[PDB]
Design a binder for this molecule. Structure first.
Ligand code: PLP
Ligand code: PLP
Lengths: 322, 322
């Protein structure tokens, strides 16, 4: 309320000052690490033959900086190592070293509110016809201005979603959704359907009449004081994990379990959650209002708890910009 | 077969001559087209912010050159265009132009036995939060020495497969498999499974007890004089099409339909088919001989028919290397 005004006014203020440095500082529009080299993001180039491109044989993770403060970086670094493990990849540098390069990269950019991406690929030699010991994994890392999956102004009113019906989410026994990946075939078909049906956001089923996740976000339904989020079929979001921390402190029950589609049509409130946007209310579903079409009271306490946590020492730390 | 001798000895002869040119000709190991430029393949670099990298937002296709003759290039071009249409991409150049460039690229490398790849991506601006008319699709093309999914000498004995049980193929209502794509998370999982179980080649199910395809190839079963190949849930291969043309010429019935997993344990012969290898016999399945472990008579007739077609003007044209 006054909390949204404080978050978005501070952002816009910080953005004006970062825009001013675009003249003097060539990393102010983003910075990339490639084969040990720092370059502007618009000029970064990867080998054609990298298997991240050739066969999307990669995982990634995406921490964030708000107001000069890394949010939950170590959760994102732990998830990345665990993602690596499951695809028989290994992070090419020590994690302590990766964390320091990240802090360096944020600081030379001068970006106070940032999207940060780490990519670990199979490398220049592919799986099909190579002995596993000859395989050298490659790292890429980049910082860019914070990205909004829902713009701050649509967050005040709420977006429109559809439950997708031309597409369903890739099932875990084909590709494990707990391994962050860029195989977005289903998600792109869903974004197109959403647009075709006069909406923005797709909600994908598992094909078995339950909900999973959308094109870059988790889903959370609210119903008689209780939050419900799918357990299975979905990426275990660090924004979803924050939702859960905030709820446990406000004494609100969170249920991570199978969530049937039908529950989305008789819930009190709906919101989406991601690092690239935060807490993102849905007020219209399949062309119809969500329980009056207003942004719900619990959605709003979750919203405020989440941004408060960006200033809490347990979840964040201050970067030194020189 | 003197036919296998013919083909693999002609290959080896032309290879020895291509390898000689490697110190005079910097395109002899591969050539790539990037933003209008021709460059050695090992030096080809693509923008990191390409959505082909960022979210595998792409289709591709892979025609062949054998003994200086393009093999069914017009079929692969018509399929690339069908593929682009279904993803709402557009081939960034006319197809007549793309054809001349490819021919120039093969003639400059001096490669007679070539793997040729075309990749159409979404471009530098992602689908999410960009107006459709501002999206500018990118092309990458490259030529390299012929790739063998199964080596010549293993084609003389046959290879080992497993019906996969840790992974199943991405279903068509998540990603359309008629759309050639590089989202190989399921296929890579399969290559690991197969290897962990002392085999080379994975056969993926649909999760509904039918066969689909494997990590870079279609599957074809022979049973009492009849070929059986899956219709649904697979790429519609140009090799498979050739197999089919050769079967009808020889009076052999081909059934393109649902093929149950059971049929693979009670058939007379098995073979895989792809542009990168040709006709590839399987003689051990789940660690047991297939119908006695010998390469079978219809596999052999199909093998020869397929390489005959490379010198037939209905299916191929001679390049001028100049
Ligand atoms: C498919 C998908 N699901 C869920 C999420 C939520 O992830 P997190 O809360 O860790 O940012 C993302 C992140 O962008 C995503 O891409
Ligand atoms: C998954 C998959 N199926 C089938 C094929 C066979 O395609 P084609 O016969 O046109 O090469 C390929 C080609 O590499 C493939 O990747």
């Amino acid at each position: 309320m006054a909390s949204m005004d404080k978050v978005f006014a501070g952002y816009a203020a910080r953005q004006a000052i970062l825009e001013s440095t675009e003249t003097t500082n060539p990393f102010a529009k983003g910075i990339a690490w490639v084969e040990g080299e720092l370059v502007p993001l618009a000029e970064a180039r990867i080998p054609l033959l990298d298997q991240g491109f050739m066969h999307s044989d990669l995982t990634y993770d995406v921490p964030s900086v708000w107001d000069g403060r890394f949010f939950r970086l170590d959760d994102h670094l732990t998830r990345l190592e665990a993602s690596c493990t499951k695809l028989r990849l290994r992070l090419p540098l020590p994690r302590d070293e990766v964390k320091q390069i990240l802090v360096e990269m944020v600081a030379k950019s001068g970006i106070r509110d940032a999207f940060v991406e780490l990519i670990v690929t199979r490398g220049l030699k592919g799986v099909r016809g190579t002995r596993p010991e000859d395989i050298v994994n490659n790292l890429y890392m980049f910082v860019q201005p914070y990205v909004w999956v829902m713009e701050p102004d649509m967050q005040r009113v709420g977006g429109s979603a559809v439950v997708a019906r031309t597409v369903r989410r890739v099932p875990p026994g084909a590709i494990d959704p707990t391994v962050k990946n860029l195989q977005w075939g289903d998600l792109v078909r869903g974004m197109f359907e959403a647009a075709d049906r006069g909406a923005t956001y797709p909600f994908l089923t598992d094909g078995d009449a339950n909900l999973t996740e959308g094109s870059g976000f988790n889903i959370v339904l609210v119903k008689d004081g209780v939050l419900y989020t799918p357990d299975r079929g979905v990426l275990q979001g660090v924004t979803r994990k924050s939702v859960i921390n905030a709820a446990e402190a406000f004494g609100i029950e969170v249920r991570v379990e199978f969530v049937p589609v039908e529950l989305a049509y008789r819930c009190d409130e709906i919101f989406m959650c991601t690092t690239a946007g935060g807490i993102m209310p849905i007020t219209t579903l399949d062309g119809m209002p969500v329980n009056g079409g207003q942004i719900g009271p619990i959605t709003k306490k979750i919203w405020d708890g989440y941004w408060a946590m960006h200033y809490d020492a347990a979840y964040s730390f201050e970067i030194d910009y020189n």
